[PDB]
């Protein structure tokens, strides 16, 4: 009874991507990033920027005809963080509050089987 | 003589006339005298057998591989060299192979190869240790040794000749579009200097 897309929210640090595509994912509809909605070079990951980007993505989606979205949230993954950035929650808030329906939320963060020796050296980042 | 790899004399029966046909294959490692060699589309996957590239599974190691079907062997013929089957394209039948140089080639699936690696491997690991040994090596191949450096010649003899010190004088990297008499040095070199890092650019 609805037209389903896929939200594919990639919420890293320093940026959050709101990228709605079709069910397969081959075709994308209105991929908007948190950096496109703020000019500070540091607010691109911020919840306000993520909310604005997701509002724009939802507005453009419901002119194409996407009424509901299955939700796939990911962090950077690989070997870097495993933890979603601050903007994923705001992006999901704006997606749910802009009229789009929500379905099948999932965490698709890439998780290795202990591969890819991590960047930073054995003494880590020294701050 | 002049070849590192040993040759195998394989005798077959002539299917159309009563007589024997001796063929000179490049012996693969493990091939022995008195061994039965099977060659054809329906021969088994055994070392020394000659099979079409399409009839072997991915990962098969072949040698004396034909570039075109019926050319009787072009690729991976030197001692210790071999070709790796990496996959087949059954529609418009082609087999992807990796050559000894590391290059990926698409060959007709009807082209044949000998299962195994060419015998005589590890040959270049032994230092020649002697100008005499290099002399006897090239005596049975060709008159390409010894080599006088072009920089040790006079200008009339070579582009590198002349000068009050031995030096090239201009870049030794020579354009591919240069003409005969100019192509001395590093012809059409993409890069120069000591190679550091990984090969197989893509």
């Amino acid at each position: 009874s609805q037209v389903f897309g896929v939200a594919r929210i990639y919420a890293s640090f320093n940026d959050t991507f709101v990228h709605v595509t079709d069910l397969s994912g081959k075709e994308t509809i209105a991929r908007v990033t948190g950096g496109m909605k703020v000019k500070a070079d540091r607010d691109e990951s911020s919840p306000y920027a993520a909310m604005l980007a997701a509002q724009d993505v939802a507005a453009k989606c419901k002119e194409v005809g996407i009424t509901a979205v299955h939700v796939k949230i990911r962090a950077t993954g690989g070997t870097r963080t495993k933890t979603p950035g601050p903007g994923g929650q705001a992006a999901l808030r704006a997606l749910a509050r802009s009229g789009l329906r929500i379905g099948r939320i999932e965490d698709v963060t890439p998780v290795p089987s202990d591969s890819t020796r991590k960047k930073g050296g054995r003494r880590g980042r020294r701050l | 003589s002049g070849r590192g790899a040993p040759l195998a004399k394989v005798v077959f029966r002539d299917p159309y006339k009563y007589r024997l046909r001796e063929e000179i294959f490049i012996a693969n490692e493990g091939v022995h005298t008195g061994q039965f060699i099977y060659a054809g589309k329906k021969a088994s996957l055994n070392v020394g057998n000659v099979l079409p590239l399409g009839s072997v599974p991915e990962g098969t190691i072949v040698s004396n591989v034909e570039e075109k079907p019926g050319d009787r062997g072009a690729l991976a013929r030197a001692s210790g060299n071999y070709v790796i089957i990496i996959g087949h394209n059954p529609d418009e039948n082609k087999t992807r192979v990796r050559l000894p140089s590391g290059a990926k080639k698409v060959i007709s699936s009807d082209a044949r190869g000998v299962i195994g690696v060419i015998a005589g491997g590890g040959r270049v690991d032994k230092p020649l240790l002697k100008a005499g040994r290099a002399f006897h090596k090239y005596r049975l191949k060709r008159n390409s040794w010894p080599k006088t450096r072009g920089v040790a010649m006079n200008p009339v003899d070579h582009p590198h000749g002349g000068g009050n010190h031995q030096h090239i004088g201009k870049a030794s990297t020579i354009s591919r579009g240069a003409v005969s008499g100019q192509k001395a040095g590093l012809i059409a070199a993409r890069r120069t200097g000591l190679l550091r890092g990984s090969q197989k650019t893509q």
């Binding site: 389903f4 069910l23 397969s24 081959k26 075709e27 194409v64 999932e106 965490d107 998780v111 | -």
Partner: protein, 212 residues
Amino acid sequence: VVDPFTRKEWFDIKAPSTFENRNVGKTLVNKSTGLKSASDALKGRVVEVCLADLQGSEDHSFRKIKLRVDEVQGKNLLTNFHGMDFTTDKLRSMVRKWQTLIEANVTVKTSDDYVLRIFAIAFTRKQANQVKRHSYAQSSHIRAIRKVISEILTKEVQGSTLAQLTSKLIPEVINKEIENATKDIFPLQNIHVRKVKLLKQPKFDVGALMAL
């Protein structure tokens, strides 16, 4: 200034043949042109749909199903089983401390032509009256359990087609078979077939595909 969505037309992914429900959703693609056919742009798309959204029963919220479009037939994408996997949240919820995790993987050929890799998972469990707080296995019970699971998976496959294997995965009868064959080794609370992977497809066989 192009608006690429003006030239895109919608299609309906009539994806399964027997799961519970024909309709799974819609997808859009560029309209057919001379040098770029929409039928070519389609027919390779893989869609991941929840087994609960395929069966109508909420007890299938995990075990997503991959379906690859095998044929584009008049706004109807007729697909077939392409693979299944548990959800990350479900898998992490079953993977708990103070218990032994047992994993088994088999590479099998189905009855007709299909090559699959089956990953099954199981976890040791506490008894009703256990005082011990971890309930670990003895690394030979693990080997016996892995052997039993491998035999069970290689017997369930090699005796059924891809569609029959799918229709046996939906009820989770393999989980019950593993439980019955392993209850004499270790409790194994959480037996599951966590993943089915399609390794090599046979010839297209449009006749066999045309079952929906």
